[PDB]
Amino acid sequence: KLSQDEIDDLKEVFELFDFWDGRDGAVDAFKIGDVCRCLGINPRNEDVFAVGGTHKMGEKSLPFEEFLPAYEGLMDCEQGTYADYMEAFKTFDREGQGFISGAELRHVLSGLGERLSDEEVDEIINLTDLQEDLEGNVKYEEFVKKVMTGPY
Amino acid sequence: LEEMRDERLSKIISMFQAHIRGYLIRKAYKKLQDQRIGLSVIQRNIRKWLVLRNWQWWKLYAKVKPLL
Amino acid sequence: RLPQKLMQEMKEAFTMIDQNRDGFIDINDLKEMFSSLGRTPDDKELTAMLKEAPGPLNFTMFLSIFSDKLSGTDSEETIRNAFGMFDELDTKKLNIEYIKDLLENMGDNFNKDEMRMTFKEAPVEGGKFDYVRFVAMIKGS
Ligand SMILES: [Ca+2]
Ligand SMILES: [Mg+2]
Numbered sequence: 001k002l003s004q005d006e007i008d009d010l011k012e013v014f015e016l017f018d019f020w021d022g023r024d025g026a027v028d029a030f031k032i033g034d035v036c037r038c039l040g041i042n043p044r045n046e047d048v049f050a051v052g053g054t055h056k057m058g059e060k061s062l063p064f065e066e067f068l069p070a071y072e073g074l075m076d077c078e079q080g081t082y083a084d085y086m087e088a089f090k091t092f093d094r095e096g097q098g099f100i101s102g103a104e105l106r107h108v109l110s111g112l113g114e115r116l117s118d119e120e121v122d123e124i125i126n127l128t129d130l131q132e133d134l135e136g137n138v139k140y141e142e143f144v145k146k147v148m149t150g151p152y
Numbered sequence: 153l154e155e156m157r158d159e160r161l162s163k164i165i166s167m168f169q170a171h172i173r174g175y176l177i178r179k180a181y182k183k184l185q186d187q188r189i190g191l192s193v194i195q196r197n198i199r200k201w202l203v204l205r206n207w208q209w210w211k212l213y214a215k216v217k218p219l220l
Numbered sequence: 221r222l223p224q225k226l227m228q229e230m231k232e233a234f235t236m237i238d239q240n241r242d243g244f245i246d247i248n249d250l251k252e253m254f255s256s257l258g259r260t261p262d263d264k265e266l267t268a269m270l271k272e273a274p275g276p277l278n279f280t281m282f283l284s285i286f287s288d289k290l291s292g293t294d295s296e297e298t299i300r301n302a303f304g305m306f307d308e309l310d311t312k313k314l315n316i317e318y319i320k321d322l323l324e325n326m327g328d329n330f331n332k333d334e335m336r337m338t339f340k341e342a343p344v345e346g347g348k349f350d351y352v353r354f355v356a357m358i359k360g361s
Pocket of ligand 2 (some may be wrong): 238239240241242243244245246249
């Protein structure tokens with residue numbers, strides 16, 4: 001399944017993360033999801049726990065050859081589509097015009113699902129330059145598109 | 153039933169949050185690579201210093217250095 | 221490496237210390253160089269410096285004495301920018317707990333003795349590590 005191009009990228013990212021946490025040829029199992037995120041996949045935290053991700057730093061560490069199979073396991077995690085996202089935000093859209101209040105938006109991101117921190121929510125809103133109008137409403141479609149297309 | 157409806161909405165939200173987490177990490181990646189080089193530079197230069205600071209040849213060398 | 225500019229620096233230093241234009245550094249060159257800078261070490265210090273070289277102190281012998289100890293060193297500018305990497309807002313300082321954490325727990329970890337000798341004379345005030353001044357220190361003397 002994994003092309004050599006892909007295996008090379010994983011090595012490069014593994015080494016980055018294998019140094020930031022003390023160069024010793026291993027990556028803390030807590031950073032599993034983060035390594036796989038840099039590689040372009042978007043696993044849910046539940047997905048990463050399922051492949052051996054831990055809940056805290058320092059509990060366990062992985063050599064590359066134990067890491068490879070974790071990555072392959074995550075590699076086919078289910079990933080949301082634009083249609084799924086629009087259906088989801090529409091359950092919160094009061095008049096179906098494509099607006100949601102900035103506060104409802106913060107409610108869904110940090111009060112539901114795999115809750116994000118306020119810092120994380122502030123940052124994604126900052127980075128995507130999502131702004132609300134004078135009544136404090138946002139267009140969730142713009143936000144969904146920007147998050148999906150990524151930082152570049 | 154209605155249970156499935158709630159559960160799939162929760163998964164969808166969680167996948168969107170996964171997308172966000174993805175974005176956040178990928179955006180920080182370049183700085184992380186840069187900072188790795190930066191810290192390598194810092195640790196190695198401090199270490200080199202700790203060895204040469206009491207070596208007389210170095211003390212000479214570092215006084216010559218500013219004069220070219 | 222070692223980088224060409226570092227080779228060029230070494231050759232230039234060798235050239236200045238060789239007041240003889242001899243192509244060699246001897247005890248007279250060394251005495252001459254030291255007196256031009258301040259206190260002149262006594263002949264036994266000078267002789268001992270020269271004995272670190274297993275032959276007459278050629279430029280290649282000079283390279284041989286400095287190359288390993290200088291090989292991975294970087295300019296004051298490079299190191300300063302390295303620190304800048306962790307100083308987003310360009311305050312020219314770092315929180316003391318931040319630089320300790322980076323050095324000790326990340327990359328090629330500093331051990332407790334490396335930590336102690338590093339921060340012994342470090343310019344730290346109000347919880348702020350003055351890295352511009354620290355860089356001057358590690359490159360000075
Ligand atoms: Ca490691
Ligand atoms: Mg001479």
